[PDB]
Design a binder for this molecule. Sequence first.
Ligand SMILES: [Ca+2]
Ligand SMILES: [Ca+2]
Lengths: 158, 102, 966, 61
Amino acid sequence: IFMGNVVSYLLFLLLFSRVLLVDFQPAPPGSLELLLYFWAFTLLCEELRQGLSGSLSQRLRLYLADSWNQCDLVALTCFLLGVGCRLTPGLYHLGRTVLCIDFMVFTVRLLHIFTVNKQLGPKIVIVSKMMKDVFFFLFFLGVWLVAYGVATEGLLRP
Amino acid sequence: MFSYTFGKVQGNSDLYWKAQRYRLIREFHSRPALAPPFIVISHLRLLLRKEAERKLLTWESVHKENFLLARARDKRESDSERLKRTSQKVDLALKQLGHIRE
Amino acid sequence: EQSWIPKIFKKKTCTTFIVTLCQCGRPRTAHPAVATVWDSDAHTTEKPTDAYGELDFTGAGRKHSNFLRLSDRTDPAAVYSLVTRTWGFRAPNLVVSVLGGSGGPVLQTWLQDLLRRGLVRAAQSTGAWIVTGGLHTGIGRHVGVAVRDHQKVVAMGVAPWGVVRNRDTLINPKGSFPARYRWRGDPEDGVQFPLDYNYSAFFLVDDGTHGCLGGENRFRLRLESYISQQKTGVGGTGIDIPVLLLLIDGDEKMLTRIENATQAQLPCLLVAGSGGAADCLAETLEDQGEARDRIRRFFPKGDLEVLQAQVERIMTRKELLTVYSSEDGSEEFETIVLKALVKACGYLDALRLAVAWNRVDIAQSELFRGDIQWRSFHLEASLMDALLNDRPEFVRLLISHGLSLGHFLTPMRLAQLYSAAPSNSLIRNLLDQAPPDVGHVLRMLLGKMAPWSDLLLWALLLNRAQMAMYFWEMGSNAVSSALGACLLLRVMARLEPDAEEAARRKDLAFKFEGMGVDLFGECYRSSEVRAARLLLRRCPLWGDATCLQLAMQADARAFFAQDGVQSLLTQKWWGDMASTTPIWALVLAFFCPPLIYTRLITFRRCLRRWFHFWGAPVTIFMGNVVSYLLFLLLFSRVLLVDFQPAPPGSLELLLYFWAFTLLCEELRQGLSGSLSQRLRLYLADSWNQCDLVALTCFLLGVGCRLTPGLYHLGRTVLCIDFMVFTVRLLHIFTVNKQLGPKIVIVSKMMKDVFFFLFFLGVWLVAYGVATEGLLRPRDSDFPSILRRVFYRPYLQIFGQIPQEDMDVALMEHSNCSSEPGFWAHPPGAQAGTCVSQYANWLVVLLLVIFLLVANILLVNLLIAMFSYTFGKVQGNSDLYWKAQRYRLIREFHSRPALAPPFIVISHLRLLLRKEAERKLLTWESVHKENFLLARARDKRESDSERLKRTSQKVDLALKQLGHIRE
Amino acid sequence: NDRPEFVRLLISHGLSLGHFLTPMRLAQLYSAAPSNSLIRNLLDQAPPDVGHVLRMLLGKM
Ligand SMILES: [Ca+2]
Ligand SMILES: [Ca+2]
């Protein structure tokens, strides 16, 4: 079941890219785009099933507590928003941009695959724990960039 | 910093992964057998809708008794416990020696 | 399996009536329709038993105290079989049938101390059974409380059915596996008693009576006799189980029971000072007789001549009777039992019995006295018993007594020893598949590609750690035997159905490897010219395979790690040249052949030196390296310059011939180094796989080149083949003491590499597709799309950031496309004719995030993972390199002395075609003895052992102090 | 009185435990909760009535 799910998700990403790069046009959606809409709807139904069966509020919170479920939910929300914007006559470009970001959100989900390997799962956990060091570096670099950039801009006087 | 953190949280991360492995397996144990593109056909199906045990417990109890006996024997044969027993026996010998001296 | 229990066991009914009240203990009213002197057998009926199962005393207990109800006239063989097999009780090495009325609930302090310290302790030590009355009264209660205080011990209780309180709750014809018994019934009358809760199993003898005493005596005596007729395990090898009766106090009934037991040839132990019916016999044995009977025994029947006649009949067989000397409470039970059994005996030996028990001190005392004079078979039988029952200490002691072992072991005895394999054990299966016929199974395990040796092999096969250890200590070829034992144990472990059994074999193999390495270290540090140069390089009787071969097959990395073996391998690597020769000296000699004869290199005489220099593995390796470098140089020269569509030139033909010679060399390596077996062995090496793929690509490229139409394809294939060939040069660093471990660690870094690659691939796909979608370049060509989606983002990781092709601020605005919106014209060739500029700040933001993640976070994470892995697998990699060093040296030891370009001339040659040893073994044995003595002394002087000895000495002093105080 | 050794020894003497424990005895045992202890508070919030507090702690989900 896991392997079939992985293969289907890879095919879904392939179709999403195919639609986004080629078949996405201001005209009304084509056959492939409608297939993508149906596929995303089935993914939404699957997430709904996972949340619903897995004390309604209790199990809903239990489902929403998982990071991967949060990622799936945000991806699907962005997809719905992008489709809505695209269908509207005036918000075509905004919809395309939202879907472009949503593709990144969907693709990041593939990292879940490595949680099954005996060696990669611990690596992903450690990576998740590296974020304090990442933030320290980012804050230090931001301070340094502000200082240096403002000093140089003031000196040059463009 | 990355090197230090990676070296520091190796064991805890491994334990955490081993723990959540059960959650992963259980999640994929209950999912529909079909893929998301076709999973609609299965969500539709979901919609519209002893003596052996006693023997097992007895065997478990036998193993528990063996484990407890092993722990007790290991503790009793430890150096600290043997030293304590020797001290008590020496004290008993000393008391009997004082008693006989009278 | 219980339905058979009712089939073979029967209970008794009141049946016929004998007078108001039945003579069968039941009221005349409560009798069946069928109801002079009532008969326990004639006036009763037998029905299937309906009170079997096990007892679960409420709360405490082992949750299992097997019970049973059976007729008195029952054959004890069935009872013994049921107890031994069905209920799981092992065969008793000794049975103590405790007797004694012990009038009055209270018992003397010394008697209670003896029971809790002499009897119960001995029973637990020897795994004996204690047979008493399964009731909470009389001596049974005292025995039970002694057992409880000592606490397990097996206490069988044979009691009548009818005097047991709450007999109703036990009745369940279907079975009573969960049985609940309330031994604490409020009424307290002598008619019935409660079953004690300290006894492991009960036998409720049924004689068709509702209360009586002595009705079970017949069955008890019959069971005692039958047990005394059995054997002490190991099939018929064991001696007859000793069954003796212990008596404390008593009465005329006890005297009759003692008489019956003596008639049954059962030793009796009479406790001195126990009381009446026991001190009477003790005094009679020690030495008016009627006066003794009157004073000691109760006044009734004292003047009766029956008592005196019974005492006379008892003394008629006084050999069986023995008095437990008070000795101020000696509490030395095992020795007294042994003395009583010896006296009764007047074959059965104290040695065999001591071996049956695990008491080696008792046998040590028995043999230490010079009074006993032993013969050959006498000790041989005991040694066989010790071997069969896995008693290493006893075999050590027996061998220590000058027992000749060469004549002891015989094909019949060896067959018996192997026959003792435990039920369905791997050794048993292998023997069945294959007299012992051990050679066939040994060859099957290894593949086939002196009593001590045989006994060591047997112990290894049966996996008896201590016995195999001892046999190795007494063996001749210590180091080779240790390595062979490690090999055999590892092979068996890999071949075992159950992992837990395999782990024991694996641990034993590890222990043998440790002993082998320690002993060889001792031998080497004593004398290097011997030991390594001779012990390792000789071919023993194991498989006529040198110890190094055994270590290689066993994967005994620890054995290769030690400095002695490494120094020997280095010495073999340099051949006859001194191991200290500098590398530069070797190079100079290689390029200046005459300089070999100069004193600057240290070792017909001329031809001898010539062949010594050019045959050493190191010089062959250097020549091979030089030839391979020249081959790569020629390959590059051909590929870059002389490769043309025209027919091959001279240099290209030379390259073809050179590659052909390399192919022939690989063929030779695979062929000579069981055709399929050696082929797989060759193909298993990674370097051989690399060579094979390189040569296959070379053949494919040459074939394509020769074909008129596939010239370019051939050139491309050869271009890749050059990379494949060049990668082989990494094999050079496997010889350096520092680089080889590095290469091993590098090979182990691939998991981290793959993690990084997968992460980077996911990130690249996401970012590239997002950027391509945002820009909307109008090329929209599949190769161009793939380029912009994968290649360009990938190159951005290495500082190749084409801002002009992504940032609209750096491009020229133009109305390229008729589609609505604003567009810009990138200057890049493959950047798309024009890109949308709707939200370009988002493209720049994605570029910023991608640079951050990829360049910094992922790369630094990979560095951290590499650092961790490198630090973690240092030692294992070093050991692995030290182990494979032998394979490298052996491979280069057998190669032709000529280089691949000329190796054809040598492949052609290949085609068309003591007392010193005994002295060496003796010296090895001396060193082994020294090493074993050192280990034993170090263990004895350790703090833990000294503390244990002090505790024992303190206990001895305490016992002597208590003794003197009296 | 929290004397594990004594309870071990007493049980070791063939004391029948099934008949020993009774609802009154269990109520007494739970009544021995020390003054204001978490168990005491939970019992007050909820005879022992232990099942309810057990479900509350576990949640009975
Ligand atoms: Ca999910
Ligand atoms: Ca090769």
